[PDB]
């Protein structure tokens, strides 16, 4: 079909976030059988393999931003691979890794579709700049390299000379915000980005939130949707094996509802599954719940509705 024509891109990258172990991001999501669980329903799954990320030895940090050149080279290599798999007319399923890859994962998507809209499901806004950060981790700064309105408030970070800001402030939607910096909230209220924090999700309910989200992005003109999904945006009772978990998150029901309503538009054109960290589960059962949750989110992005699916032939024979 037009949708559920997946090109999987692994990206085992960890040098944006401190908790080392998300390098087993694509390894664990593939050994849980994401490919085989996609291949029952009509999914033309083509694995493009994990990317080879080199190890730059003299990775001298910025003022607070640390490991800048490795993240810049990793996102440039990823953006090249995403532009390759979107010239094949597929849906760029990227799965890492950490949110530092989403710079390339949205830039390479915007090399083909310049009018995309990002549904950034995350506990955090990830909209810190290299000037307003406190951690300096680049899993907290992917959005501020991508917004067109933040051109000029971004210093020339080494390794990010290729990054062209590709989306505007009114073309991105946050769902699930519950841990926002003061600098992040000031940027989020200055630019006027439509965000659905957990206050609005508790108020309106996930049905009204997804209805207003799809009306905000797709109400004016049908355009590609790039769901960049984080696994700490869901509640840590469902995904405890993530990098920066924040309690009081989206329930597993509500996450599956978000992905089902994105699928029923039929305009999904890129999926990002970041911050899966299998080395942080206190039991292997916690890792099992995290990975089964992320796999179920991806499968509900690509057609598996909870009400059931049937192939269009008669079964009473």
């Amino acid at each position: 079909a037009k949708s559920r024509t997946i090109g999987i891109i692994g990206a085992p990258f960890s040098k944006g976030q401190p908790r080392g172990g998300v390098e087993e991001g694509p390894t664990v999501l593939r050994k849980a059988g994401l490919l085989e669980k996609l291949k029952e329903q009509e999914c033309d799954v083509k694995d493009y393999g994990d990317l080879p990320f080199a190890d730059i030895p003299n990775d001298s940090p910025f003022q607070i931003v640390k490991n800048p050149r490795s993240v810049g080279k990793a996102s440039e290599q990823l953006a090249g691979k995403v532009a390759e798999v979107k010239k094949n007319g597929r849906i760029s399923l990227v799965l890492g890794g950490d949110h530092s890859l989403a710079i390339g994962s949205i830039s390479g998507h915007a090399r083909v579709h310049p009018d995309l809209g990002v549904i950034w499901v995350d506990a955090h806004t990830d909209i810190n700049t290299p000037l307003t950060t406190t951690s300096g981790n680049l899993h907290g700064q992917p959005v501020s390299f991508l917004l067109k309105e933040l051109k000029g408030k971004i210093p020339d970070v080494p390794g990010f000379s290729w990054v062209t800001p590709c989306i505007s402030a009114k073309d991105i939607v946050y769902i699930g915000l519950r841990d926002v910096d003061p600098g992040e909230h000031y940027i989020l209220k200055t630019l006027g980005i439509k965000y659905f924090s957990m206050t609005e999700v508790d108020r309106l309910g996930i049905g009204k939130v997804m209805e207003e989200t799809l009306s905000y992005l797709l109400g004016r003109k049908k355009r590609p949707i790039h769901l960049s999904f984080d696994v700490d945006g869901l509640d840590p009772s469902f995904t405890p094996a993530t990098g920066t978990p924040v309690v009081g998150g989206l329930t597993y029901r509500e996450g599956l509802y978000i992905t089902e309503e994105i699928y029923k538009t039929g305009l999904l054109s890129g999926l990002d599954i970041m911050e899966v960290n299998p080395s942080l589960g206190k039991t292997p059962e916690e890792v099992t719940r995290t990975v089964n949750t992320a796999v179920a989110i991806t499968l509900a992005c690509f057609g598996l509705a909870r009400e059931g699916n049937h192939k269009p032939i008669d079964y009473l024979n």
Partner: antibody
Amino acid sequence: QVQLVQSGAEVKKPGASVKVSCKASGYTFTNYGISWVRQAPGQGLEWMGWISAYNGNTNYAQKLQGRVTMTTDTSTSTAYMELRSLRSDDTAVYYCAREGAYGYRSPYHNWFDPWGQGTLVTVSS
Amino acid sequence: EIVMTQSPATLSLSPGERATLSCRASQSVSSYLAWYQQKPGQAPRLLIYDASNRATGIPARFSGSGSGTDFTLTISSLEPEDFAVYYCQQHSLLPRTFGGGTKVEIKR
């Protein structure tokens, strides 16, 4: 400066625990995370637990799950480490040091740089 | 759980030239490990925080390298106050093992 004052040299037979205060001063607490590391004399060192003072994150290690409990007192910035079912193999100098909290706002830290002066704990009857 | 192995178990080098050490990992810690200076009866003082960069009060001579499996610690200007057991610590994998011990003796 950036310190960790500990207290104190305590001897417990196999019985009740050796809850050690690890008082932090100089740096902003609830912006980092204190971990603990043991050292038997004439041996190596073993990491044995790490609390984040941001939000109470236990995250213990293998072989003592179980035996250790670790809390904070962040009105006055100390951090505690109790024990359970004490044993004569736990004759060590219990150091506390700071990993840094791995939240979202807490800064980059991976390397134990406040170090406390250690605590003489010999467990005998 | 990653065993961190140090290839000089002991070491005896007179006050003088370089005393380059070793810390081999069992996986790819990838430029995320540290170095220490536990003197006998003291707290382990930090030497190197992430494979280089000389952490905040080190005199002139304790540079190291890595990235990402077998690391080095160079003591270029040996300085006989430095006769202490050195420990390497991986950090970006849990649980957080240390090295074994690198007892730099005196060489007569």
